[PDB]
Write a protein that binds this ligand. Structure first.
Ligand code: G75
Ligand code: G75
Lengths: 306, 306
C-alpha cells in the first residue's frame, strides 16, 4: 500500500554526467559513448544571451575551446557540432558506464524523472510531468543547465529532457536530446512566458483508479456521464477535454477495479462540482494530475483491495 | 526556483542491492564489503510469522540454506549471524561497488530517501519523513522487504532504514541497519498498530522559510508570539510542541530571510487558526511537514528573492 511520486533509480544516468566549460561558463553535459551533449548556451556570455547568433559564436570556437571533466578526469574534445539547441562534443574516450539508451520526445501529460546536477555532480532526483503548456514544475538553481530527464524501461534509459531555462513564473523549459525545445521557447532573452496551463484530465482519472486499487471508494457515485457532457464540465474547470483515446487508455485500470471509465468520469464531475468535503484521496486534499495511467500500473498492486 | 520532494541520487545504493532466498521466501538484501544484510523474517514461513522463535528457526539453518544472488551471479554464503531483527550473511566476495558508508539511526521528523526494490532489482526512489509515531508513509508491495532508506553526505552513504512490514493503516515500519526497530513494533503477527501521529512543527516552519526564500510573503503578519503561547495553539491543532532547540536550529533560515523564528511562529499560528483562504504556499494548499531545515538549505537558493 501507499502511493508516492516515485522517480526511476538514477544510477545509470549518474554515470553519464560530466562538466562542460567554455570560457567562464560551466554547466552539465551528458556523456554517452564518445559524445557529450550540452546546452548550446554554454558558448554565450551574459550579454550574448539577449541576441546571440549561435552559428557565429560557434564558428569562433575550436575543439580546445571546450573543457570536459568527468569526475577528476579531463576528456579531450576532438570534434564539435551544433544540433538545434544543443552541442554535440566528440571526445577521446567512450564512456565505459554508457547504459543501453534511446532518445525520446515525450508528449504533454507524460512524466519523467529529473536528475538535478551541478558542476557535473548529481544532487537530487524527482519526478515531473510535462505540462500541457510544455513547461515542467522543476526545482533548479544557477548551474543546473544540462541536467537531464529520463525514464527507464527494463534496463534501457530513455532520455527525454535537457534543462535550459527558467520562466518568470518559476517553471522550467528545456529540450529533447535532439535539442528541440518543448513548447514555443527559445534559448535567448525575450519576454517569453509560459502559456496558460490546464489540468491533465487523464492523469486525474488514473489517480482516482489508483485510489480504488488501494482500497478507497468514497468519491464514487451512482451516476454515469457521456463524454460530451463530461467535457462541458471540464471546460468550466480548466481541465483538458477527455477523448475516446483517453477512455481506451484507461481500459486496464477500469478492468482491474470494475469501474467503467465514464462512471469514473461521473465521479470526477461530482468532485469538481462539489469539492472533496474535507476528505482526502490517497492522502491528498486536491485532485492530483502528475501520475499517468502507466505510473499507476507501475506502482500499484495488480490486485485491487476490494 | 521551484521546490520539490527531492531524493538523493540512488546509484551508490543500487550497486548494493541483492536477492536473498531461504526456502521459498525471497526478499532483498544489502551487500556491503563481504556482508549481506536482510530482514530476519526471510527464515520464516507464513505460519511461523504468528509466533516465530528466531533463535530456534536460525539454529536449524546452515550457510548453504541461504542463496544470495547479485545480478546474475551467485554469492556463496560462508557465515551467518543474527543481529536484532536482521541477519548478517558473510559471503565469499566483497562488493566491488561498496561506497563509503555509515550506519545511522535517524531521529523522528528527519527525512531520507527510499530505494524501493523487488527481487534484488531497484524499482523506484522517493523521499520519506520518519513520522513522530515511528512509521513512514512509503509505497511498498509484496517482495519489497529489505529495501533500504539512506541519506548521502558528500560521497558517503548513511544507511538509516531497512523495510520489514506494513501496518493496518497502510503505513510502513522497519529497522535501522543494526536491526533495531523504529518504534515499538516487532517482526511477528500481532494486532500492532501505528500510534497517534503528530504534525512535525519544525518542518512546517522550515518550509515556510523555503517559501519566503523563493519569494512569497503573503502569510506573514505584524504579530509575534511567545514560545508558550504558540504551544497552546500547537496542542489544539495536533502539532508537536516547539522547543528552544527547534528555535536555534532555525537560526540560519531566519538569518537568510530576516524573519525572527517567533515571528514566523506567529504567522503559523494565524494559518492554523484562519486557514489559507484558498491560497497556496509553494504550490501546496496545505501545510507541508516532510521537509527539514536541512532539506530546505540543501534545495533552496542561498539568496532570498527579496
Ligand atoms: C542554467 C544555466 C545558468 O545557471 O546560467 C547562469 C544563470 C540556468 C537554469 C536556471 C537558473 C535558475 N533556475 C533555472 O532553471 N539557465 C539560465 O540561467 C538561462 C540562460 C538562458 C536560457 C534561455 C534564454 C535566456 C537565458 N536563463 C534563464 O533561465 O533566465 C531566467 C532566470 C535566470 C536566473 C534565475 C531565475 C530566472
Ligand atoms: C515484505 C516481505 C513480503 O513481501 O512477504 C510476503 C507478503 C513485506 C512488505 C509489506 C508487503 C505489503 N506492503 C509491505 O510493506 N512484509 C510483510 O509482508 C510482513 C511480514 C511481517 C513482518 C512483521 C510482522 C508480521 C509479518 N507482513 C506484513 O507486513 O503484514 C501486513 C501486510 C501484508 C501484506 C499486505 C498488506 C499488509
Amino acid at each position: 500500500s501507499g502511493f508516492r511520486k516515485m522517480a526511476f533509480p538514477s544510477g545509470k544516468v549518474e554515470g553519464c554526467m560530466v562538466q562542460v566549460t567554455c570560457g567562464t561558463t560551466t554547466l552539465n553535459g551528458l556523456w554517452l559513448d564518445d559524445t557529450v551533449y550540452c546546452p548550446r548556451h554554454v558558448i554565450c556570455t551574459a550579454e550574448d544571451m539577449l541576441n546571440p547568433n549561435y552559428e557565429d559564436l560557434l564558428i569562433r570556437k575550436s575543439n580546445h575551446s571546450f573543457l570536459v571533466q568527468a569526475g577528476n578526469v579531463q576528456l579531450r574534445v576532438i570534434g564539435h557540432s551544433m544540433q538545434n539547441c544543443l552541442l554535440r562534443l566528440k571526445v577521446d574516450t567512450s564512456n565505459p558506464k554508457t547504459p543501453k539508451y534511446k532518445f525520446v520526445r515525450i508528449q504533454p501529460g507524460q512524466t519523467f524523472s529529473v536528475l538535478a546536477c551541478y558542476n557535473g555532480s548529481p544532487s537530487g532526483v524527482y519526478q515531473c510531468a510535462m505540462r500541457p503548456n510544455h513547461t515542467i514544475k522543476g526545482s533548479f538553481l544557477n548551474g543546473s543547465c544540462g541536467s537531464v530527464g529520463f525514464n527507464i524501461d527494463y534496463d534501457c534509459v530513455s532520455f527525454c529532457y535537457m534543462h535550459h531555462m527558467e520562466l518568470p513564473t518559476g517553471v522550467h523549459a528545456g529540450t529533447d536530446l535532439e535539442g528541440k525545445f518543448y513548447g514555443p521557447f527559445v534559448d535567448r532573452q525575450t519576454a517569453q512566458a509560459a502559456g496558460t496551463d490546464t489540468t491533465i484530465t487523464l492523469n486525474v482519472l488514473a489517480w482516482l483508479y489508483a485510489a480504488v486499487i488501494n482500497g478507497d471508494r468514497w468519491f464514487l457515485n451512482r451516476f454515469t456521464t457521456t463524454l460530451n457532457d463530461f467535457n462541458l464540465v471540464a471546460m468550466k474547470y480548466n481541465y483538458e477535454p477527455l477523448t475516446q483515446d483517453h477512455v481506451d487508455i484507461l481500459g486496464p485500470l477500469s478492468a482491474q477495479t470494475g469501474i467503467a471509465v465514464l462512471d469514473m468520469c461521473a465521479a470526477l464531475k461530482e468532485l469538481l462540482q462539489n469539492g472533496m468535503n474535507g476528505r482526502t484521496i490517497l492522502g491528498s486534499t486536491i485532485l492530483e494530475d502528475e501520475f499517468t495511467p502507466f505510473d499507476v500500473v507501475r506502482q500499484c498492486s495488480g490486485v485491487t483491495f476490494q
